[PDB]
Structure 1
Amino acid sequence: GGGGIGVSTGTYDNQTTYKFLGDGWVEITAHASRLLHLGMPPSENYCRVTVHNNQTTGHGTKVKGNMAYDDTHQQIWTPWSLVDANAWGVWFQPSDWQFIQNSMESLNLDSLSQELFNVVVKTVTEQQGAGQDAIKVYNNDLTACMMVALDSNNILPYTPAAQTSETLGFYPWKPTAPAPYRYYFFMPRQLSVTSSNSAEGTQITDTIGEPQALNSQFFTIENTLPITLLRTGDEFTTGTYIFNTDPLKLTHTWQTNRHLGMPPRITDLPTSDTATASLTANGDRFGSTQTQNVNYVTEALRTRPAQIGFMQPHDNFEANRGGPFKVPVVPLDITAGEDHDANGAIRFNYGKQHGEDWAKQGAAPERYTWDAIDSAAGRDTARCFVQSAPISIPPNQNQILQREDAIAGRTNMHYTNVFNSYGPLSAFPHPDPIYPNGQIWDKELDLEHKPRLHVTAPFVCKNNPPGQLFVRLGPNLTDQFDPNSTTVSRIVTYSTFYWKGILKFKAKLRPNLTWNPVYQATTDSVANSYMNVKKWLPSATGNMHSDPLICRPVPHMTY
C-alpha cells in the first residue's frame, strides 16, 4: 500500500503554466522534469588533488607570457555528485522566454521545490558468448540504495554548475547526468610576471605551497549532512524554498549623459525634412557647466545629474596568495567601437546538452559572445579623452590625453587600460539574464562588505541560497572484503532516477505608452539569419540546437 517496487513514487511534469492574477501581475510556475543518471564514483575516497601547468612548452606556465593560462589550483574531489538545476534553459522553452521578454516589464523569483523519484539501480554482469564477444547483462538490484543529501544550511562550498556548463540538460526528452561535486582547497600559488620579450636569462618563479593551518578547510558530506537512503520504492523531497530577492527589469535603457534633462532650445524649426536646426550661439546660451575657464555652454560641457556608466580597468590581472586572476567587469554596452573587454562582454563555452548544435562534429565546444542589451552605460574607449584644467578648447597635443597615447612607454598600453572612473555619481543597469545558458540565482559572498552585484547571475539570495542536492551510489560490495586493505572490489552498478522541480516567478505585464511600435523578439524566415526558425526546429535526424535569445527588447526612459 504505502510502498513497493511496482508503484511509481512521482509524476513527470515539465509544463510551464501562466497564472494571470489581475492588475497585470503574473504567477509563472515552471515545471521541469528530467531523467537523471548516476554511476559509481571512480573512487570512494575523498581526494585532495592538485593541477599544476608548469609544462615549459605549449600553454605551460614556465613559458614567458603565459601567465593568463594558469590553471594551477587544488581541489577536494568527492565521490558525491551534484544535481544542479540553476540555469535558464532548464526551466523554459525558447518560446516561453520570448513571451516573457516581449510582454513583461519585470520578473522576480518566488519559490523552488525539488523531488527525486522512481529510483532504479541496476548491476552489470559479463556474459561470455561465442566468438570471444562478451555481452553485458543488466539486472535490477532491488535492495540497492542511492544516497541523497540536501544541504539546507549551506555548510558546503557553493558550486554553481552553470559556469562550467554542468547543469541539467536543456531538453526535456533527453536523459541527463548530475555533475561530480568538487570544491577548491587553499593552496599557496606564486607566479612571476613576464612578457615574450623578457630577457632569456630571466627565471620564472612558478611555485605551489604546502597546506596551511590557518586556511585549511576539509569538509565531508557524511559528517556535515543528514543522508537519506533511497531504494526503488523510496521518494525524496526538498520541501519548498522561498526566495528573498530583488526584482529584475525586463527593459533596457538608451539614455546616456547626452540625453539627460532639458534639451537646448532650437532657434527655429527646420525648413525642410532634410534641414538641420540651429541653437542660440554657445556664448549667448543659458546653462551650467563645471568648466569655468571658457565662457560658453555646449551640449558636451553641460552639467548632468550623474554619470551613466563608468570606465573600467582592462584587462586587469590582480594576484593574491592564490595566483593571478582577471578582475571581473560589469557587463555594459560595447557601443559602436565594439569594445568587449572594456565593457565586459561575456563569452561562454558549452556542449550539445546545453544547446550546441547536435549536428556539429569535433571536440570543440560551441562559443558565443554575449553583449549587453543596454545601449546607455557602455564606454567607447577610442572616443574617450581627458583634457587639462584650465580647459583649453581646442587643446594642443600636450593639453589632451587620448587613447593613442602610450603609458610608461609601452606602445599598446593606454591610460584607458588603467583608468577607473567609478565614483559616487556612477549609475548603470543590472547584468542581463542570459538564456538558455545563464545562471538564474547566486549565493552572496560572506564578507562584511559585499559587492553591489554579481556578474554571473541576475538574482542574488539575500539570506541563504537554495540548498545544494547531492547524490551518490554507495559501495556495492562483493563477497571478498578486507576492511584493512586499501583496494576494494565492488560490483559494477549504476542508477537512473527522475528529478522534478518547480520554480515560481512573479512577473508584471508591460505598459505600452509610446506612439511608435516597439522592438520585439521575433523569429524570421530569412536564410542565414540568426533568428531563422530552422534553428529552433528539429532536423531530419532529430538534431536540436538552442542559441541565446535576446532579452530586454523594449526600452524604458531612464530620466
Structure 2
Amino acid sequence: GVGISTGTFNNQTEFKFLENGWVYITANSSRLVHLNMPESENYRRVVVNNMDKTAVNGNMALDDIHAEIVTPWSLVDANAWGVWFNPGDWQLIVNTMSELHLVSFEQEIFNVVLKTVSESATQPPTKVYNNDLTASLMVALDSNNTMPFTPAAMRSETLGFYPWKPTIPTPWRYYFQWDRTLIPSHTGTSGTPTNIYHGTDPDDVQFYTIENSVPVHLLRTGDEFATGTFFFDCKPCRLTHTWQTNRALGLPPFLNSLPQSEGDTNFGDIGVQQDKRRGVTQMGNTNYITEATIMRPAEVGYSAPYYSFEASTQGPFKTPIAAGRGGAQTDENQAADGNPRYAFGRQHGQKTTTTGETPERFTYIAHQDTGRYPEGDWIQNINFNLPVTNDNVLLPTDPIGGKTGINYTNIFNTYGPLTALNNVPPVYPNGQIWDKEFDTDLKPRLHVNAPFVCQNNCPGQLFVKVAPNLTNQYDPDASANMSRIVTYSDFWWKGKLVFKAKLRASHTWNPIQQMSINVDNQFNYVPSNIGGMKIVYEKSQLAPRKLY
C-alpha cells in the first residue's frame, strides 16, 4: 500500500464542440480537503433558544429557535457554481451559449493521509507531527438518500473556489422536530405577547444514524473511494431573459401620424379617440381601449404579499417569491420581486487578504422583467366612470387596516391560472446548482435557490469522517468520554460535473449584451502583489428572448 499514488489532479474545463451548435461541458474540480477529529464521537440533540431577541416585542423575524442534532460525521458539499468554473469559463457559457443542460456527476477521493500530533511539552513547548499509516478514514455514501438533504451552499459552507487553495468539509447536522408558538408584537404592544417552546411531537421523531443506515468504507492511505457516474434527469436552464411585460405583447396600434423630423421628443400620434378605437378589451362597461385596458392573452408573473411572514407548527417564516426585476434598477423594491441576498467570506469570494468576521454580499438583480413596481397599481370601482374618484379607488398610498406603512399591495395576491413565469437563473459563483425535490404529492413549480431541480432522486450525500484512534486506556463503562489520539487527515477530492448546452445564433441587428473586461473590472479577476483573490458575482442571463 502506503508507497504509491492512488489518483491524479485535474481542474480543467473541457469544451467538446459537437454537431448542430451542441457542446459538451465537462468541468473537473480536484480540490485537496483537510479534516480534523470530531469533538464528540457521540450524537447530540440540541435546542436553540434565543428568546432574548424575540422579547423586545419588535423583533419577530429574528427567531432563531430550532432543534438540531449534531453528527460526528463531517459532510462534503460541491453543489455550487464557483467550484466548477472560474470567471473565465462562465463568460464563455454566458456570451456564447443560449441554454444549458446538466448531465453527469461523479466524485472521487484519493491520496489519503492521516497524521498524529505529539505535543512535546519542552520549553515552548513544541509540536511533533507523525503518520499513523494504519489509521483510517470513514467514508459514507447515501446512495439511497435515506437521510435529510442539507445543501451547504445556503450558508456558504461549500468548498473553496480557488483550486490552489486547500478547503474544509462542513460538520454535519439536521433538523429535529421542534414545536413552538410566537405571536407578533410591535414597539407598542403592551405586556408579553406569547412565545414558547412546546417541545417535540412524539410523532414526528426521526433520529437518523449514518452507522446504522449507510455503510461505511474504512479507507487507509493506499485506498481510493470513488463514486459512479450520476445521471441527472432535470429540466434545462435558459441563458435568456424575457423583457416583455403585458404592454409589450401583440400588435401595437397603427399610427395614423408619424413625425417628419428627428428627435425622441417627436412622438407619432395614433390619431383616434380612446372611446372610438377598434379592438378587444376585457371590460363590458367601457368603450375605452387603452395599452392598459386592452386584452392581452395572459399575465406575466404574479403579485403576492411582500414581507408576508407566515407561520406554522415550527414557527414564523417569510413567503418565497419567483419574480424577475420589473422597474429599472433605480426603481426596485428588491423585496416585492424577492431578489436573493448572498453572504460568504474568504473561501467563497471576498478578498482573500481581508480580516474580521464580516461577510460581503450582493443582491443579485436579474435581467428578466416579470417583476413589479407595486407603487403604480390600483383597485377601482366596477363603474369605472373615471377620472376615478378617491372613494372609488384604493391606491398604494392609501393605508389598509388603519396603519400607515401598510398597503393592499402588501396584502395583495394576483396569481391566476393566467400567470406566466420564468425560473430563477443561476447566481454565480456562490449560488446553488441542483436541489432535491419535495416529497409532497403536489410539488412546487420551481425552486428559488437552484436553476435545476432534479425529477427523480439526486446524488447521495458524501459524508466524510475520521475513525476513532484509541489509547492504552479506555473504559467503555465510563461516564466521561474516553481520550483518543489527536488525529487528523487530509485527502484529495476530485470532481467531474458534466453539462450539455446549445450555441446562440444572431437574429436581430443590434448586438446583444455580452460580458467584458473594463478598466473597472481588470483587478477583479487577478491576484495581487500579496496574492489577494476573490470571485465576484456576475449576471447569468444576459441575452434577449421573445415571450410572445
- Please indicate the TM-score interval, normalised by the length of the shorter structure: over 0.9
The one-letter amino acid of 2:168's match is A
2:334 to 330, 333, 340: 340
The reply to whether residue 485 of structure 1 matches residue 478 of structure 2 is yes
The reply to whether residue 250 of structure 1 matches residue 239 of structure 2 is yes
2:257 to 240, 243, 268: 268
Query: For each residue in 1:51-95, what CA deviation from the matched residue of structure 2 results, as whole angstroms up to 9, or x when unmatched?
Result: 10012xxxx112202111000001010000111100000000111
The reply to whether residue 50 of structure 1 matches residue 47 of structure 2 is yes
Looking at structure 2, the residues matched to 251 and 334 of structure 1 have their Cα atoms a distance apart, in angstroms, of 16
The one-letter amino acid of 2:503's match is L
Query: For each residue in 1:324-377, what CA deviation from the matched residue of structure 2 results, as whole angstroms up to 9, or x when unmatched?
Result: 1111111420523211111101111111100011233221111211112212x1
Query: For each residue in 1:96-128, what CA deviation from the matched residue of structure 2 results, as whole angstroms up to 9, or x when unmatched?
Result: 111000111100100100001100000000113
Instruction: Say if 2:366 and 2:541, in contact at 8 Å, map to a contact too.
Output: no
Looking at structure 1, the residues matched to 169 and 269 of structure 2 have their Cα atoms a distance apart, in angstroms, of 65
Looking at structure 1, the residues matched to 200 and 375 of structure 2 have their Cα atoms a distance apart, in angstroms, of 46
Gaps of 5+ in 1: 527-531
SS state at 1:223 partner: helix
- CA gap of 1:127–1:309, structure 2 versus 1, over 3 A, is same
Looking at structure 1, the residues matched to 199 and 395 of structure 2 have their Cα atoms a distance apart, in angstroms, of 47
The one-letter amino acid of 1:86's match is N
The reply to whether residue 277 of structure 1 matches residue 254 of structure 2 is no
Identity value in percent: 52
The one-letter amino acid of 2:510's match is N
2:158 paired residue number: 167
1:235 to 224, 233, 236: 224
- CA gap of 1:285–1:334, structure 2 versus 1, over 3 A, is closer
1:154 paired residue number: 145
- CA gap of 1:334–1:353, structure 2 versus 1, over 3 A, is farther
Alpha-carbon offset, residue 286 of structure 1? 1.3
The reply to whether residue 6 of structure 1 matches residue 3 of structure 2 is yes
Matches within 5 A, 1:308-387: 308-336=300-328, 337-375=331-369, 377-387=370-380
Looking at structure 2, the residues matched to 205 and 152 of structure 1 have their Cα atoms a distance apart, in angstroms, of 43
2:248 paired residue number: 259
Looking at structure 1, the residues matched to 364 and 387 of structure 2 have their Cα atoms a distance apart, in angstroms, of 38
Name whichever structure is richer in helix by fraction. 1
2:169 to 165, 178, 197: 178
The reply to whether residue 124 of structure 1 matches residue 117 of structure 2 is yes
2:464 to 463, 466, 471: 471
Q: What is the aligned residue count?
A: 542
The one-letter amino acid of 2:211's match is E
1:198 paired residue number: 189
SS state at 2:387 partner: coil
Alpha-carbon offset, residue 272 of structure 1? 1.1
Looking at structure 2, the residues matched to 133 and 74 of structure 1 have their Cα atoms a distance apart, in angstroms, of 43
Looking at structure 2, the residues matched to 524 and 257 of structure 1 have their Cα atoms a distance apart, in angstroms, of 35
Looking at structure 1, the residues matched to 222 and 503 of structure 2 have their Cα atoms a distance apart, in angstroms, of 43
Matches within 5 A, 1:23-102: 23-55=20-52, 60-102=53-95
Query: For each residue in 1:507-551, what CA deviation from the matched residue of structure 2 results, as whole angstroms up to 9, or x when unmatched?
Result: 10012111111111112014xxxxx11011101100101110111
1:518 to 503, 507, 512: 512
Query: For each residue in 1:388-411, what CA deviation from the matched residue of structure 2 results, as whole angstroms up to 9, or x when unmatched?
Result: 112222101111111001011010
Instruction: Say if 1:334 and 1:340, in contact at 8 Å, map to a contact too.
Output: no
Alpha-carbon offset, residue 240 of structure 1? 0.7
Looking at structure 2, the residues matched to 34 and 247 of structure 1 have their Cα atoms a distance apart, in angstroms, of 27
Instruction: Say if 2:276 and 2:287, in contact at 8 Å, map to a contact too.
Output: no
1:306 paired residue number: 298
1:20 paired residue number: 17
Looking at structure 2, the residues matched to 206 and 296 of structure 1 have their Cα atoms a distance apart, in angstroms, of 54
Query: For each residue in 1:193-251, what CA deviation from the matched residue of structure 2 results, as whole angstroms up to 9, or x when unmatched?
Result: 1111112xx22322112332211000000000011000000000111100001111101
Instruction: Say if 2:257 and 2:271, in contact at 8 Å, map to a contact too.
Output: no
Query: For each residue in 1:258-286, what CA deviation from the matched residue of structure 2 results, as whole angstroms up to 9, or x when unmatched?
Result: 00000110003221122210113123321
Looking at structure 2, the residues matched to 552 and 318 of structure 1 have their Cα atoms a distance apart, in angstroms, of 31
Looking at structure 2, the residues matched to 266 and 557 of structure 1 have their Cα atoms a distance apart, in angstroms, of 23
2:388 paired residue number: 395
1:107 to 100, 115, 134: 100
Instruction: Say if 1:373 and 1:432, in contact at 8 Å, map to a contact too.
Output: no
Gaps of 5+ in 2: none
SS state at 2:61 partner: helix
Instruction: Say if 2:109 and 2:226, in contact at 8 Å, map to a contact too.
Output: yes
Looking at structure 1, the residues matched to 390 and 459 of structure 2 have their Cα atoms a distance apart, in angstroms, of 57
SS state at 2:18 partner: strand
CA RMSD between the two structures: 1.0
1:453 to 439, 446, 453: 446
Q: Which segments of structure 1 move beyond 3 Å, counting only runs of 4 or more? A: none
2:281 paired residue number: 289
Instruction: Say if 1:392 and 1:399, in contact at 8 Å, map to a contact too.
Output: no
Instruction: Say if 2:76 and 2:158, in contact at 8 Å, map to a contact too.
Output: yes
Looking at structure 2, the residues matched to 387 and 243 of structure 1 have their Cα atoms a distance apart, in angstroms, of 49
SS state at 1:554 partner: coil
1:496 paired residue number: 490
The reply to whether residue 430 of structure 1 matches residue 413 of structure 2 is no
Query: For each residue in 1:472-522, what CA deviation from the matched residue of structure 2 results, as whole angstroms up to 9, or x when unmatched?
Result: 101111100101113211110100001101000011001211111111111
1:187 paired residue number: 178
Matches within 5 A, 1:203-214: 203-214=192-203
1:553 paired residue number: 542
1:541 paired residue number: 530
Looking at structure 1, the residues matched to 181 and 257 of structure 2 have their Cα atoms a distance apart, in angstroms, of 67
Query: For each residue in 1:131-164, what CA deviation from the matched residue of structure 2 results, as whole angstroms up to 9, or x when unmatched?
Result: x311111101100000000001110000000001
Name whichever structure is richer in strand by fraction. 1
The one-letter amino acid of 2:158's match is T
Looking at structure 1, the residues matched to 410 and 366 of structure 2 have their Cα atoms a distance apart, in angstroms, of 20
The reply to whether residue 462 of structure 1 matches residue 455 of structure 2 is yes
Instruction: Say if 1:289 and 1:302, in contact at 8 Å, map to a contact too.
Output: yes
- CA gap of 1:334–1:254, structure 2 versus 1, over 3 A, is closer
Which TM-score applies when normalising by structure 2? 0.97
Which TM-score applies when normalising by structure 1? 0.96
